[PDB]
Subunit: 306 residues, 2 copies
Amino acid sequence: EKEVIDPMAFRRALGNFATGVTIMTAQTSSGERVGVTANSFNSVSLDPALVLWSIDKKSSSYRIFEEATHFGVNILSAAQIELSNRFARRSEDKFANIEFDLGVGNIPLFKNCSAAFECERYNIVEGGDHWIIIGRVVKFHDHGRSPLLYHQGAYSAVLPHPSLNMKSETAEGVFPGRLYDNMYYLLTQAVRAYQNDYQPKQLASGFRTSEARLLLVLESKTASSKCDLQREVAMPIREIEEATKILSEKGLLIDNGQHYELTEQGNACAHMLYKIAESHQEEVFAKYTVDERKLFKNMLKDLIGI
Amino acid sequence: EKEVIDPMAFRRALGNFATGVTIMTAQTSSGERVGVTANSFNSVSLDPALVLWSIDKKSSSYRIFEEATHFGVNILSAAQIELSNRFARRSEDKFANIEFDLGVGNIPLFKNCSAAFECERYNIVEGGDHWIIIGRVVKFHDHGRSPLLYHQGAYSAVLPHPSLNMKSETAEGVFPGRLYDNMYYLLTQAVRAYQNDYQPKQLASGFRTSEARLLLVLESKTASSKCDLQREVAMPIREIEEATKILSEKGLLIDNGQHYELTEQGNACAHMLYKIAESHQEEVFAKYTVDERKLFKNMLKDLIGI
Ligand SMILES: Cc1cc2nc3c(=O)[nH]c(=O)nc-3n(C[C@H](O)[C@H](O)[C@H](O)COP(=O)(O)O)c2cc1C
Ligand SMILES: Cc1cc2nc3c(=O)[nH]c(=O)nc-3n(C[C@H](O)[C@H](O)[C@H](O)COP(=O)(O)O)c2cc1C
């Protein structure tokens, strides 16, 4: 006896494992290039230096990866969401107007990535409805740029710094070291404390990141179109479609032909998410004047540059 | 003669791919049980439901994963750094004083995780100095808790929210939607902008996250133990040892046998990292009074709870 696994509910469960984001590329001697956004990448071995990913067996790009003797792994930085979206959708020329260099074996390498790996195709292994492609790394580029994150269906970023030592007996002892008493560290630890308050409440009310973002954006109806919407929620199109379907089942959203609109329940759920977020600062700043609180927001906007 | 890339430079480069953190567990019919912290996990296939990970061929736990018919994947939450560290070090009893449940095939399952996957051992594939273990998922748990991240040798958290539209001619148009105009959103965008200023300057200096943290902490924690140090910098032991070896070869750190100590050049680098962080806010808040900046800092600390 083997258990039947629902594939969409299993896909949602996998969204709990955060990953960076890559684009796998290859080009033949002929001149045919492929590039495929992928988060199935991981490392295997240091010597020999080996990495792997999993490509759909129905992919139109599989033939080129199978034939080309070399392929590249581009680790996207936080600034490359547009690249990630371009190479996630079939089109006539995914590379149109992209700048890229040629590594060994004609590997296409994008500029401004967090890192890149030039691989020789090493082995191809059966993987259910995917093929597992194992590559030997023969060259790499390590730039260190802050990476693009993919988690619970949505694009995010890495929050810097180790946490405060919150059981310390001394006042300055809360900092991991005294040079962490600085404005940058304080801001990251304020975010971390806000998230620790807000996140469990959002989750206990039954919303995951991708659902939450669609509710908050669709409530305001600011350019409610498919390309405009993707840009605002920072999610893949495949994840927008999946998340509007769930919201539809919860009675929160209507998919009227071309665009999406919340229902009255959906509007109330969006507003409930706002009140949760605003709850923490309401409590923490209850004893500050309106002027002080107005001032705090303005200094925040000054660091942001708005 | 066989040419290979430097394994330790390669490991550093792989640090650019962010991942979650798992513990892999198994218990055989004879009662032998294992748990291994791992971040080589990823998904393979939706139908059949397949995932994989890679384990070191010299692992003393491999024999039990090879014997057990079933194994678990526990996706760790942000609050489980202690569990992560516990299951990353060889030990007489990793499971001592740890609460856990048993799944199918007596899989050890930990409490308070982000998610967990019960697998039947499906296939073991040659992986250089690792074995690639493929699992068929027979049951999953989807809790959605904020995840533990691992990036450039160190533990971090997720920075939430879609980025604001910096090219907006209107104040409202900056936000992905109007309900994102709240304190929590503004804090995360503040962190984003700060990091976009700080990060390329820390990179230009040659430091990755693991090195930077060690510098900042060791600059004032001149006598910390190896346990306290792991807790303070939020890095596993194995990364601390790798990072201090790099810092030693750069001339920034000495290992006198008992403790780690920064050199004169190490101290100067720690203070430079501090200046970079402090310089952004110093420029932006120049126009505010001495007491206005004091008020801002005090309000941040109220948010934190210190
Ligand atoms: C975040 C993200 C991760 C993805 N990861 C993978 C992957 O690991 N493997 C895969 O085959 N497709 C993945 N895709 C989908 C492919 O990008 C998509 O099928 C492909 O670009 C379609 O073009 P093709 O049919 O020419 O391959 C991913 C898409 C997104 C948005
Ligand atoms: C964040 C992190 C990720 C790790 N990932 C892996 C991995 O993917 N594969 C592996 O074999 N070991 C990995 N390790 C190391 C093992 O956890 C460690 O070697 C093991 O627990 C040693 O015990 P054993 O010799 O009894 O297996 C990782 C350690 C850490 C801290």
